[PDB]
Symmetry: C5
Subunit: 206 residues, 5 copies
């Protein structure tokens, strides 16, 4: 309708796009994972394929507006390509990530954004021991590729990976799955980088 | 011709595109499935591959015209990218859905739209017992990814999946195939989301 | 060359693109198949891979010109994106079609266009009996996805499939291959649709 | 720098792109192949995978300039997308060709263009006898997909395929390889088409 | 915010893009490799699959600015598509490289650029002996596709490849990996071309 088209026109045409966070104006992204399925294990290459959602939230003043000035609209859907999004990357991936869902974000009048893409990922993981009762553990680090912790900071809402949607007939059952903020330095660069470490222990279902 | 060229110009360059449904102007999408073939079963990863087509219908006021003002044209075909389409998604997919058909829709003068994409889909399914005679049952949910039931509702015209085009020499025969609207809640959000549950019982032929 | 640049400019830059055929302005589209190779047969999924050319022909008034007014130019080549092309689709495909040739068409001064995309296609076919001498038969139906026979008058030139390019050393030899216009109705719509039925009889070469 | 940006501007922004050759203005394209590696052989489907360079050369008056008018610049590199390039295609491919190199041409002040993409090609080939000492022979025809002998002629600079940088540690070694111009009819068209026939004889290296 | 938006505007939208290096204005690109994983070895086709990232650095006069003129901005992240990048290519690749990371570069006020794409590469390599103690050695050649040494020169900051991030549970363990500038001629062309030669020695992880 008219107001929403007016609102989206204002936010996206009145101004050039948000150029990303800076040291002067850093951003915090809240990251949470929903694990759908461990689809595949490959012991000839030590790769494991994972289907999951990645819940992302951040807030920008450039996406703020007054609902009264727009027929009481307090939020809207929009293509993730219309707006800036964080370069959150899985560091142990072995193939380009595969997108499983539409890429549409919800923007709220207070400038907050929620974006939840579903993905399939192959990543480095030695599955040796997956057929035992103890199972095997693998770890994933999700973080910004190019922004240090002075520009993008990460946090979680919970330490528990959401398993409420996990496929009950998966070849693999999950014994535990956690998500933990952590920080490290890389050789190339002087500043610390922030990541959320996904640690998943699993085994062959029986 | 010039009447159609004028009408399309008067609809797509006339106004900004439809920004999608809202709670004040919700949209009901009608869905129907035609199952072409169960192509492949993988008992090592619990994936099944389906080829099907999905009939989508919906109606937008912004796509309306008086035919009399355009040489009596009552409907036209156009690229799906020229118009807004619903984000209907298979929730259990394990690979990006592969489109097999041109992405073209028909728009009628009353604003109604019909879009029928053919697709190959890999989804989550334990096919254990497909080699028996009782067969195996798998379930598939299709729904808007980002719109709740206050924004997009869904409907089916029939509970029967259309099987009149099913491959007679498929490696798998279909014992039953239903499509049912249902309401679900998800951990991230408090609102109800609507899906259409595709339940397919099948076995080796 | 200046004449051709000027010609393309007048045909494409001036008026908008042809919006496709309609009930008020039906269009004849001619189809012929040149079968190149049956690459692969999979009896675990009943899928067959075929490599072929699809010769497409049609004619538009909006693409006509008088050669006299353009240095006696009688034809040119142009990107398929510059013009309308028919949505011809293989109905029994199981994977997206893989394009093997450049997407370029030839336009002649009388307005006729020829577009010949080479393609690799996987489709449903039960190859039980391919190893015998009576061989196996498979049917494949090509047609517009969205245009009925009120809009597209689909036809072949000949009923014989062009086999003069078929790979002599293929794993599979062709016993017979026909191409025939047929009229079908579909559940969704009341209009009759036109397709070309491709029937191919083939066996393992020996 | 200044003079080069000015030259590229004057070439690409003043007049539009070369629209391709015609009957009355044909273009001769020179072609050489450099074989890098026969990567793979598939005897269940009669497909062979090849990695090669394709050296293309042609000349356009519309790409000529006076170097003295442009700071003694005699040539320059530019994205292949900024200029017209010929639609050379392998007729016997079974999968879309994969590009392995940047796609950048060199344009020289006399209007001559050199373009050398590296590619991987799956094509129709019977490897029956690849493990013998006499090896097996296969052939590949390369030509414009849509320009006939009236619009594009092809020539080779030599009859011999460049094998000087072939990969010494390939599963397959090359006994001989030739490239030869030939003229051919196709069922669709009365105009003959020119191709270059690549004939390669190889065997498994031991 | 506003200054950053204004700065990017002046660099990209006002001046036409850099047309690349020439003999008159040659360019030096510094390259360094960080090897994450040897995923796969195919002895039926002599291909090896490798996951690595590649650190690239160069400097352009045309990317310089005075920070006091732009709210003290000394650097910024920008899409790799917004700027010129070197056409560094693995010569031995057998598949198109698969990009694993966002394609975002960092540009600094002195005109220097840093770009670190992560990639999966399939390349030609005979892995015979990979299941032995002594292992197998393979060589990769990275260089410009179309610029000779008169237009693009290369260097490493060190001769030792970075192995400290190598996945410890790979199927394959690395014995050594070096990265060395080298000069070559090619049949088609009269000018020397520069590359960094990456030599990796590895074997199957056992015991
Ligand atoms: C700027 C541009 N790209 C970078 C890539 C990486 C890093 C910093 C970068 N800074 C370290 C952290 N993230 C991945 C690699 C290495
Ligand atoms: C806004 C944006 N993305 C969403 C993704 C999902 C959901 C709601 C969203 N709302 C729940 C339902 N649909 C899929 C997942 C979870
Ligand atoms: C408009 C848009 N899409 C359609 C898809 C199909 C059909 C008609 C359509 N009309 C029937 C015929 N062609 C393929 C399927 C079903
Ligand atoms: C116009 C457009 N496409 C064509 C494709 C081919 C041919 C002519 C064409 N002319 C014959 C020669 N080139 C490949 C096939 C057949
Ligand atoms: C200009 C344009 N393309 C080239 C391609 C190559 C070469 C030089 C080129 N110069 C030699 C070096 N790079 C790869 C091949 C061969």
């Amino acid at each position: 309708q008219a107001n929403l088209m007016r609102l989206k026109s204002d936010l996206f045409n009145r101004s050039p796009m948000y150029p990303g966070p800076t040291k002067d104006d850093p951003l915090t992204v809240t990251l949470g994972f929903t694990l759908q399925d461990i689809v595949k294990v490959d012991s000839s290459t030590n790769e494991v394929d994972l289907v999951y959602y990645e819940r992302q939230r951040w807030k920008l003043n450039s996406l703020m507006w007054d609902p009264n000035e727009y027929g009481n609209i307090t939020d809207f859907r929009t293509s993730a390509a219309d707006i800036w999004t964080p370069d959150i990357t899985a560091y142990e991936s072995t193939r380009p990530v595969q997108v499983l869902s539409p890429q549409i974000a919800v923007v709220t009048h207070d400038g907050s954004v929620m974006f939840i893409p579903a993905q399939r990922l192959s990543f480095m993981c030695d599955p040796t021991g997956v057929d035992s009762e103890e199972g095997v553990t693998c770890a994933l680090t999700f973080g910004s590729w190019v922004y240090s912790g002075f520009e993008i900071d990460l946090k979680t809402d919970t330490d528990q990976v959401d398993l409420s949607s996990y496929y009950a007939s998966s070849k693999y059952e999950i014994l535990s799955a956690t998500q933990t903020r952590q920080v490290q330095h890389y050789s190339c660069c002087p500043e610390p980088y922030i990541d959320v470490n996904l640690v998943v222990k699993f085994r062959e279902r029986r």
